[PDB]
Design a protein around this ligand. Sequence first.
Ligand code: NA
Length: 183
Amino acid sequence: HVSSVRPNIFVGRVEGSAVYQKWYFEVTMPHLRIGWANTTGYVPYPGGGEKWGGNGVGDDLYSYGYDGAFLWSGGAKTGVNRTHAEEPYIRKGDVIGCALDLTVPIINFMFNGVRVTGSFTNFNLEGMFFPVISCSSKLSCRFLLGGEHGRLRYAAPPGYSPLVECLLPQQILSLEPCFCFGN
Ligand code: NA
């Protein structure tokens, strides 16, 4: 009953770049986790090609999730302060903010425009990061990427870009050296 979705959006670290290294998106509306997954979590598949090594965001070593009450990575959960005392920790109308600063690196979360006290730091930067929701049946959640792809309810943090700006052109020489493809 638990599925994961991502848009076809991948961001990655450019050594020493001061532009488009910080990304923000929101999610709005049983299991529900939101965050970022890194493509290092993909593993070889017998026939050939690769499959995702985990079930949902936060269950493998290379994804980083938040369910309203806990931070998740590598299948471990870390309690944070919460807006609802009991499950469901994320309710209809609530809006989850999710932020990735590749220069630190650090991943932060927000609940209804309030910063979550808890973050992911010092994580692997090889490969690329994509936004992800892991949801059970009977839940319908939407990525808010900015622009006409889902209006953000909150201002992106200072220095951060909505993911819809992945559609803007950048010069190739300014996008290297990068770590998106595995050293
Ligand atoms: Na890249």
